């Protein structure tokens, strides 16, 4: 019963935080899983990709292919990437659909204002000052999911509420 | 914990056969494992890569980076490609060893003569962790050789 839990959302909306708490819950309940994120991807397989529209397109494509393999192998694969473009997220869904694997698009949704008040790594302030260019939500677009399987309201639910909602979806869809 | 079993050898030497047999043995002993081969890599992750030297180097680099994720995830990852160039296998190796993830270069070794008599350029591994003489060992014997290797380094 492998599947891919595809997170998407602005920088600082809560993707890393949710993925890690979701991965902890699953391991403790004896469900194999693995998380793909900036740390293990953008410095390994995707070390040769930047942040131009084309390189974010290829970033997501390779991640989709990789996730599909983990899902195929029997793991719950959590991906934790901004994935700002609808086309690429829809392509990632297609990849899993073609291979008959369950794909759950989870919109991790905190408003831009909350993300920048959180400013977890000081990035929004730099982006605003033009010291970083093409930052998502300031200088390049984030296209919100039109029909995700789940929307996580990370400004109104705490981390554990969010994890429980994802687990709920996984139960209803017969993964766990 | 996890590791990469990196098969290398001529066409018809026995990589597909060994990997299928090894994966079967591991799974029925409750050990997680997944195989990367042309069937799940070539038209997916590496579909935007052609036949040029630069693309073949990038082909191997990506496979090695995906295998490392499976090892890190805790699976025995078996890769099954001809993998002809020493520079490329060393690259794959360094990707793993730099993260302290166990990496086994396994030479699937049958003479060219036999490989053609099978009918289902290459640079021979310099110091591979294991040689499988597939002309003189049967499939099950080759599997036990790999499993014995895995048992030594606390993988299996
Ligand atoms: N130009 C940028 N836009 C958005 N995030 C960036 C940028 N440069 C570096 N980062 C950062 O890289 C992370 C986002 O990387 P990804 O999630 O891999 O983005 S994606 O758009 O290609 O999906 C952010 O947490 C972050 O701090
Ligand atoms: N319900 C929730 N889910 C996730 N994070 C939350 C949250 N409520 C508050 N936070 C906080 C914790 C983190 O400091 C911050 C999110 O940062 P993050 O998970 O690193 O973001 P991202 O990975 O999307 O860039 O917001
Ligand atoms: N010990 C052994 N290991 C692997 N294959 C063996 C073998 N002894 C005989 N064979 C036969 C079985 C297959 O028909 C053939 C191997 O072909 P294959 O596994 O498709 O090669 P490759 O994947 O290396 O191209 O050789």
Curated annotation (Swiss-Prot), chain A:
Similarity comment: In the N-terminal section; belongs to the APS kinase family.
Region annotated Adenylyl-sulfate kinase, chain positions: 1-175
Protein residues bound to ATP 1: 12-17, 157, 162
Residues the record lists as binding adenosine 5'-phosphosulfate: 39-42, 51, 56-59, 82-83, 121, 134-135
Free-text function comment from the UniProt entry: Bifunctional enzyme with both ATP sulfurylase and APS kinase activity, which mediates two steps in the sulfate activation pathway. The first step is the transfer of a sulfate group to ATP to yield adenosine 5'-phosphosulfate (APS), and the second step is the transfer of a phosphate group from ATP to APS yielding 3'-phosphoadenylylsulfate (PAPS: activated sulfate donor used by sulfotransferase). In mammals, PAPS is the sole source of sulfate; APS appears to be only an intermediate in the sulfate-activation pathway.
Superkingdom, taxonomy of origin: Eukaryota
UniProt name for this protein: Bifunctional 3'-phosphoadenosine 5'-phosphosulfate synthase 1
First and last residues shown, out of full length: 51 to 226 of 624
Species assigned in the record: Homo sapiens
Quaternary structure (record): Homodimer.
Tissue expression summary: Expressed in testis, pancreas, kidney, thymus, prostate, ovary, small intestine, colon, leukocytes and liver. Also expressed in high endothelial venules (HEV) cells and in cartilage.
Domain remarks: The N-terminal first 50 residues are required for inhibition by the substrate adenylyl sulfate.
From Swiss-Prot, chain B:
Keyword Ribonucleoprotein: no
Entry superkingdom: Eukaryota
Swiss-Prot/TrEMBL GO biological process terms: 3'-phosphoadenosine 5'-phosphosulfate biosynthetic process; skeletal system development; sulfate assimilation
Entry GO terms, CC: cytosol; nucleus
A molecular-function term among this protein's GO annotations: ATP binding
Quaternary assembly: Homodimer.
Family affiliation: In the N-terminal section; belongs to the APS kinase family.
Function: Bifunctional enzyme with both ATP sulfurylase and APS kinase activity, which mediates two steps in the sulfate activation pathway. The first step is the transfer of a sulfate group to ATP to yield adenosine 5'-phosphosulfate (APS), and the second step is the transfer of a phosphate group from ATP to APS yielding 3'-phosphoadenylylsulfate (PAPS: activated sulfate donor used by sulfotransferase). In mammals, PAPS is the sole source of sulfate; APS appears to be only an intermediate in the sulfate-activation pathway.
Protein name per Swiss-Prot or TrEMBL: Bifunctional 3'-phosphoadenosine 5'-phosphosulfate synthase 1
Gene that this sequence comes from: PAPSS1
Residues shown, of full length: 51 to 226 of 624
């Amino acid at each position: 019963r492998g599947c891919t839990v595809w997170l998407t959302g602005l920088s600082g909306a809560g993707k890393t935080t949710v993925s890690m708490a979701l991965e902890e819950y699953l391991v403790c309940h004896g469900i194999p899983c693995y998380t793909l994120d900036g740390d293990n991807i953008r410095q390994g397989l995707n070390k040769n990709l930047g942040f131009s529209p084309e390189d974010r397109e290829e970033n997501v494509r390779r991640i989709a292919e990789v996730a599909k393999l983990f899902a195929d192998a029997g793991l719950v694969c959590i991906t934790s990437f901004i994935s700002p473009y609808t086309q690429d997220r829809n392509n990632a869904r297609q990849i899993h659909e073609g291979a008959s694997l369950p794909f759950f698009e989870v919109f991790v949704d905190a408003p831009l204002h909350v993300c920048e008040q959180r400013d977890v790594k000081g990035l929004y302030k730099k982006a605003r000052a033009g010291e970083i260019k093409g930052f998502t939500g300031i200088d390049s677009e984030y296209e919100k999911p039109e029909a995700p399987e789940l929307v996580l309201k990370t400004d109104s639910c705490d981390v554990n509420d969010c994890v429980q909602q994802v687990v709920e979806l996984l139960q209803e869809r017969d993964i766990v």
